[PDB]
Amino acid sequence: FNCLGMSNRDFLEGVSGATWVDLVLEGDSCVTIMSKDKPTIDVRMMNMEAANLAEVRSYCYLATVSELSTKAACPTMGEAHNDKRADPSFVCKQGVVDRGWGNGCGLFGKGSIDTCAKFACSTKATGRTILKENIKYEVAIFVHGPTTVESHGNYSTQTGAAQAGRFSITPAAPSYTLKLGEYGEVTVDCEPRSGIDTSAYYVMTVGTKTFLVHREWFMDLNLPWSSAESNVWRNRETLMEFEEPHATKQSVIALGSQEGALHQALAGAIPVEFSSNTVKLTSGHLKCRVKMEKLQLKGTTYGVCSKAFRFLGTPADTGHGTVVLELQYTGTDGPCKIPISSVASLNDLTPVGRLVTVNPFVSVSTANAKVLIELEPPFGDSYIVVGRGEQQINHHWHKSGSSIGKAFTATLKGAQRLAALGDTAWDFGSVGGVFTSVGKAVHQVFGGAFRSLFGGMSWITQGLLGALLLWMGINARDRSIAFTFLAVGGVLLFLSVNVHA
Amino acid sequence: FNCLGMSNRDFLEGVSGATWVDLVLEGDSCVTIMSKDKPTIDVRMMNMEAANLAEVRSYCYLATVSELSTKAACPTMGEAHNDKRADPSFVCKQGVVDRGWGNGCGLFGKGSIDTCAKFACSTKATGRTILKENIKYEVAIFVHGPTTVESHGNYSTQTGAAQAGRFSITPAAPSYTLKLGEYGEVTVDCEPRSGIDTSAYYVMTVGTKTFLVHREWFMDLNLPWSSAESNVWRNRETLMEFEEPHATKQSVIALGSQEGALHQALAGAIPVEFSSNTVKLTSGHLKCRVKMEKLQLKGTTYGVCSKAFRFLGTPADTGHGTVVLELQYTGTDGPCKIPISSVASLNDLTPVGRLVTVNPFVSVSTANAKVLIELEPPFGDSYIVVGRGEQQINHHWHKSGSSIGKAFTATLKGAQRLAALGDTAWDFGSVGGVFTSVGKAVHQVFGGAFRSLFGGMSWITQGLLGALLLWMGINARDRSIAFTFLAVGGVLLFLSVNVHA
Amino acid sequence: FNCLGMSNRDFLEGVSGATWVDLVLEGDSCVTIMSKDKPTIDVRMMNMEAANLAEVRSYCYLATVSELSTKAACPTMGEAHNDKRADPSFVCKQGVVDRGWGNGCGLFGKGSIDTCAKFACSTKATGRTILKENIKYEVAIFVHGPTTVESHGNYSTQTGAAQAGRFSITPAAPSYTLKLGEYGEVTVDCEPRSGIDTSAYYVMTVGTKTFLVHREWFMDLNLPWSSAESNVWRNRETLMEFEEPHATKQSVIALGSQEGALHQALAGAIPVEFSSNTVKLTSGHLKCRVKMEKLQLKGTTYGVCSKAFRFLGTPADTGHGTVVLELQYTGTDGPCKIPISSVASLNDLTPVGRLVTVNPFVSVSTANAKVLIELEPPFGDSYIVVGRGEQQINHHWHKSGSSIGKAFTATLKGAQRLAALGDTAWDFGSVGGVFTSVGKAVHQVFGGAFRSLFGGMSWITQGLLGALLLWMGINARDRSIAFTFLAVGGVLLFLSVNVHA
Amino acid sequence: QTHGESTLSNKKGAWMDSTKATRYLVKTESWILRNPGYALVAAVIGWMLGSNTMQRVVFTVLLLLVAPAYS
Amino acid sequence: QTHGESTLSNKKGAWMDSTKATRYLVKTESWILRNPGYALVAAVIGWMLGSNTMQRVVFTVLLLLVAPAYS
Amino acid sequence: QTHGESTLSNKKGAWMDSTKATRYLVKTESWILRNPGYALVAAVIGWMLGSNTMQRVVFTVLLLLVAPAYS
Ligand SMILES: *[C@@H]1O[C@H](CO)[C@@H](O)[C@H](O)[C@H]1NC(C)=O
Ligand SMILES: *[C@@H]1O[C@H](CO)[C@@H](O)[C@H](O)[C@H]1NC(C)=O
Ligand SMILES: *[C@@H]1O[C@H](CO)[C@@H](O)[C@H](O)[C@H]1NC(C)=O
């Protein structure tokens, strides 16, 4: 819905005169666009929902063995053939057993047997593909206006105030224009057809849980499988164990339920919601373009309030460098601006910190009007001054950190975004430019090569290979191959550590 | 019981100066002892049976999760602790979750979460240990006497005729004297306490099937386990999954049944029979010393049969170089010995092959008496002559092979026995020679070192390491280390191929 | 509330034209601000109280052990598990003991036992955290007006005369304008949120005495601890002693009260007052900015007293270079200014010493009016002359020391303030110079690395490392590393000696 | 962790002897199939690390075996 | 074979994320403890194979990793 | 583990300021006094381990400090 209270929140400041910006709406993440002379908006995708899932393959993890039968042959009667070879749903296996005059034979040797058993599946792990014409991303846009702490996350209140709205982004309707009350309108030209690669994932349902497995990993599963809407089971010998070959009756038993073995094999899979043949995914990304031409700032014609404010509670650091606080106006001026600023001292009173809730104002005309304001104080000590003169209120605030630490954290988060999104990461916060396009193309080719070389590796193999490549590069005679090995080893070690495991 | 109709059958020759023979009775294997002027006996262990098994540890492979409860904590505070953590049979886990003014919290950050759930096991895999005082082997000794094709495998007939006996070999009674009326008596001195190393195995019951598993492998299973006669489970976090941190209610579900994952993990385990807290094992070995001094030949006082014989069928090869045939005697001369012999040609008439059924005779006095006889013809073309004069019947027989091929098969079987028994294989067929003792001591030390070095490897690791060691030995400058590497690589490759996989 | 009678006192001469000065109000200190044409004011923080403390962790230093129960197991039977292996109120331990036929066992060896005991805490040491919104410093400002000996330290009299004031400095109200009778108004702009680093301490209560302990030290206490909301105890095996492994009953006793070991471990901790969930501490600092643009003199429209004064007692040296005396006016001229000055000789009568009580006057109109006057005589011999002509009274005074020793004491106190406050010490008496900001930035950059390198070191290890680094720098070859080692060793030796230990 | 070949002198069949040959190979085979690009990486790294032909071959084999079975 | 790290750009946790570290190491560590004597074998074979210290170390590590995971 | 010098910029005394000088010396002094024979061992080892007078002195002091406080 909104970005307040989100651990994953990024701030994008558009240049002056810019009318749009390319975003990559990630799941469980929130991006806050701050443009000059324009109201601050919060864009985020809530969930990707796909309906009408088509079944592709159904594995079996709990089988049943029944109708045991064994056909034996003497050591010179050739190979034994049971009459259940012509019956489907019957798994047969040829074996040899020592025969003799005691078993009922005439010679001594390895007599051939052919034991058959009826295969019946009781619980299946059905995989379903995603049709690209049925996906729809749920995107939420929230403009920073006059809100309270209680009504900041209330979607019904923010829609009654025309300050927020949830909408769907379908490949058939890839654009949506959200009409705001007096903030104008915001439109998003998203690309839902290229957001989540549905051609590389299946929707596997193992019992009561549902996952988003890899397409190649699902096909390499060694279990009895049947095609879509078919009862012809293949590779059935994996769930059946033929015991010690006996002359008259060889025992065949079915293995235990492989449900737990599947849950262990689904270690890195992504659990998803599944009900009524539709799937909901809170994770994933959606490349979109937010156009803010008709987005206008509300309240620029109001008059600055004259009465005094008060701090209801203490301001709180949101964790992303911003500070949110709640004021309470003591007058009844009505729609009136709020003279709040972030200054370094009470002498200069020069704004050092910017406001996230740009142009804050008291909306209602009642006596005590609570207003939630979010600022962005400077590093070190500062004051949050509301008003001027004998009615002004000050609140000291110390912002821990530094501008160098901010740069390091920003570089680390950019590297993590580049590792998690690939070439799509260049589209994040992009307003065009020749550098972005050439960088995205170089990243496309380099990532294609890198995936083709080190695709199916874990963090352990990646880390060991990166260490080996660094050791080879520091001991390389030629500078070119040395630089290549150092770069590849650094990328491998970063990918090994980025998983935090 | 008897060796006839068994693919695993070895032939030991009795030394004229030795009164006892030392042999290792392997499971599903049979030993035939042929001594001069003595009846042939078949010594075979049937199974190892140990009662009063003591429970050690029971792993859980199917748990149940219910009664979920979650308690949250504000950031910048202590960790969260649920009140159900005090109650037993509850598994709790700590985690972080986003908190803020929307979650009813006071600060923004990663608040501490604490979710607990009731752990209840449904089905468990009990592991039991074998007390070395409760073990007992079932050894069967069968002396080759007058038998038919029907009564040869019938233990009731052979016991009534006093030609066979199944007896229990316990540590408290390691010796048994089997009275064979008119055939003397045979005494076996076995080592029950040292036969099967029961101190290295557990009796694991997974559902309805029971296995004999290693102790080190059984104690490395990562499953919720409980001690003997205890309902308190430990390591319960394995069968439980904490889906995603949530401030009010984090969902906890139990994994599927691990019964199939256990069956996949018991790949090389030996399936046994378990009933009434008693395990029955048809595999293993038992070192015994067979005393045959009081073993006298029966029928030496009978006369040769004077009437005509007939072959009741074509003689059949047993695969062990021996030939079995059933004769029928027309006359009623009472107990009379059969003048059967293997000759190289119908003009030499001198015996050239050895009879396994030493001193065959017709037991009953009635007409049409059937007798089963086993011979050992020489390699090549020979004739099975029964009788003399006008009543002489003969059957041409061709024995494929040679003494060189027989020697190769014998040394290959000896190498396989040495790989399967270790130092115990030197006690097979031994009469107490000084060479066997030195060989057994050298094999003891070398096998101890070899197991300490290359223990726990599969046939793939052993084969690859043996190939690598051979490649290092053939490229070694020195002679000693080269021969050492060659020997180790050769034995590793043999152990890899001996698995036949 | 004022500086008279305090061992720690600072004098800051305000530059004419500057309207403010930055102060670092240390606890148990006092800053005397003197201006050219403004009255003298004393500023000092009296305490820092913080209510509504939140419990984070409670350690137990006195536990009770009861309900002993031991569960023994035979050798080679696995570790035993007692009946009371449950979570609540029971701690267990695994041990080995000799078993045999005498102990009622079946085998001889080190049988495993598992004994459990009922853990119950008696007295606990609760640790509480400080919420940065509940802190409030108590700053006191006093103006050097007409006072006496009994009235200089009486807060009620100084507030009745509107010459002093105690006020609270909260984060929500970091600025306070203290109104005075006729001296104008003093405004302070403090920084309470960054004054005392409350995010690095805990309010630990051990019995009746409360301390302010480091966070990292409080979390490293090897003691049984529980959470805030009446949590269960963890790490309980530190207060329990399993005496000797016995077969049937292993004795478990609880250690003595660890309250003495706590008081002995809280060596360098700072004791604080704690009552009604509120902590009060006198130590610490508070960076504040005092604005004196509206501070004016009282009594400039008066005339010089015509009658004669008398010295009541002897003047006293306060130890800070100033001299406090008492005068008793003998006339009834009413409000009249006192013609007191510090001269070098009785024939010059030229003011050589600066008066601390700027513009002293007799406030009351009674006959005998006592008045406290503070002066700063020059170094050496001087006279305190009151009046002129026949009414002139003189008092010889000798001020020991010199300007060089004064500068040495000043730079020593500056180094001590820099060691005690760090980068905050640069903002003491700072008017906003360019050298101050550069010095503070360089000090931050150096002190970060210095703390990261020598953070948790005592004065002994610091002194030893300082001596070693001085020795390494003296014997160093390169002039850069030599001076680096010299500087670091000098700083370490100063920090070691600065503790006065 | 699979049980592996037992030591109890068994001339009979174990619990799973049909997969006795493919149990320690199916994972590596299925990994190298879907991830064929590593075969070039392993070959190059083994050729650049081994001074001798035997060293290069052993390096290549060890890398191509360690990549699928990550440890 | 286990599924492994997905490619959906997920910011939450996967199915079994608590075992993401010990997922591929429980088998190798448990195998080493039971079979310490192999560490000597791998060390001496790597020493006799590699001509440089780097080659010896890499050989030793690759053998000590390829022995527990037999594939 | 004792608390140690606080970082609150205090001008009064801490909890136990009378023992501020002997808190980290009572153990070493009493240890050196109850077995002075180690002082010869530390001196000999420092003289036989350092090549310069400074190295010998530092080795001697470090050993004579490590012995009483075993950690
Ligand atoms: C949103 O606000 C409406 C009206 O104030 C209220 O009825 C509703 O419960 C609120 N919902 C939430 C989730 O706070
Ligand atoms: C053995 O022979 C008896 C008759 O003498 C018969 O009743 C019994 O069934 C036979 N046993 C077997 C195993 O054939
Ligand atoms: C301050 O003065 C008033 C009035 O003279 C007196 O009652 C009070 O006790 C004095 N306080 C102190 C602390 O001396």
Author numbering:
A (entry chain B), B (entry chain A), C (entry chain C): 1 to 501
D (entry chain a), E (entry chain b), F (entry chain c): 5 to 75
What do the authors say?
Flaviviruses are positive-strand RNA viruses with enveloped virus particles. The E protein is responsible for attachment to target cells and mediates fusion between the viral and cellular membranes during entry. During the transit of the virion through the secretory pathway, acidification and cleavage of prM into pr and M induce large rearrangements of the spike at the viral surface, ultimately resulting in antiparallel homodimers arranged in a characteristic herringbone pattern. The C-terminal domain forms a stem consisting of three membrane-proximal helices (E-H1, E-H2 and E-H3) and two transmembrane helices (E-T1 and E-T2).
To confirm the structural mimicry of the chimeric viruses at the atomic level we determined the cryo-EM reconstructions of wild-type WNVKUN (Kunjin strain—KUN), which can be handled in BSL2 equivalent cryo-EM facilities, and the chimeric counterpart BinJV-WNVKUN (bWNVKUN). Single-particle analysis of cryo-EM images produced high-resolution reconstructions for WNVKUN and bWNVKUN with an average resolution of 3.1 and 2.9 Å, respectively. When compared by Fourier shell correlation, the two masked maps are nearly identical up to a resolution of 3.9 Å with a correlation coefficient >90% (50% at 3.2 Å). Alignment of the six molecules in the asymmetric unit as a block (3 × M, 3 × E) showed a very close match between the models with an overall root-mean-squared deviation (RMSD) of 0.681 Å for all atoms of 1719 equivalent residues in the final refined structures. We conclude that bWNVKUN has a native-like structure supporting detailed analysis of functional and antigenic features. In bMVEV and bWNVKUN, Lys16 from M forms a salt bridge with Asp28 from the opposing E subunit, thus stabilizing the dimer formation. Re-examination of the WNVKUN, bWNVKUN and bMVEV maps, as well as deposited reconstructions of TBEV and ZIKV revealed unaccounted densities of similar shapes and volumes to the bDENV-2 map.
